[PDB]
Structures are given as structure tokens and as C-alpha cells.
Ligand binder design. Sequence first.
Ligand code: CL
Length: 156
Amino acid sequence: PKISVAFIALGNFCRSPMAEAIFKHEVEKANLENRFNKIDSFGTSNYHVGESPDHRTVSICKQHGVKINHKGKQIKTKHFDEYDYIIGMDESNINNLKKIQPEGSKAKVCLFGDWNTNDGTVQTIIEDPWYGDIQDFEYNFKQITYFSKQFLKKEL
Ligand SMILES: [Cl-]
């Protein structure tokens, strides 16, 4: 039974759209598209609804040959029954999602870094790069790619 994954953070502008794009790219590279139904990204906030992702997230993806095309969208309560995994970037994301999640809904809310090996390659928390520089977006790329592979390796 295919699985559906939603990456959800705060603004659906920096990290979540990058995570959706990189994950799709790794799924394709691994030739496992058949195991998945939906792979999306949302934000708990409506601040960037309708907007294309941060130009720095777009640049970083393009620089790595990762396709990305998205418009900001806000989480909906039904998303907890729609997706098998609802993956946050940082702890504040989890706090908010856990407070919104209807009891008994199927979605397994978790931090992407939960798939970290803790082998020193990357840190567990995917920090919001918005107030930073392109190097923070670059490090996010590295973390998301790493957790993407770990996920495909552990969940399938
Ligand atoms: Cl959040």
C-alpha cells in the first residue's frame, strides 16, 4: 500500500518546500516512485500561501539538479487522515502539529531528524534559514537529503 508523506513546517516557504522537492528527487533516484501516493508540503501558517518558495531554496535545489515547483499552502485538519507521515523540520513544528492533530487520526507526526543516525554527518534539527544566508539553505539541503535516504531505507 503506497504511503503518503507531507513535510510541514511554519511558513511553507523555506524548508518544507525544499524537503518535498528533495524527497521526491531521492524517491525517483532510488526508483521507488511506485511505493508512494502523495508527497507534499504545507505550513502551519498562512503567511506565504500562494507563493513560490524562497529564491534561496530554489537556487540551492537548482544547483543540485533537484526539480522544484510549489505554491505555499496551509495545513488542514483532514491532512492528518490523508497522510501516513507528517514530518516537521524543528521542535516548534512538532509542538504545533501535536496540538492540532485530531486524536485517532492516522498521520504519524514526527521530526525528519528522527531518521538521523547520529553518526556526526548532520545535525538532527533542520533550522529555519530565513534570517540567515544561502549557506544555511545549503546545510538544510544536506540534512534533508540525508534524512530522505535514511527514511527510504528504514520505512519501506
Ligand atoms: Cl510550526
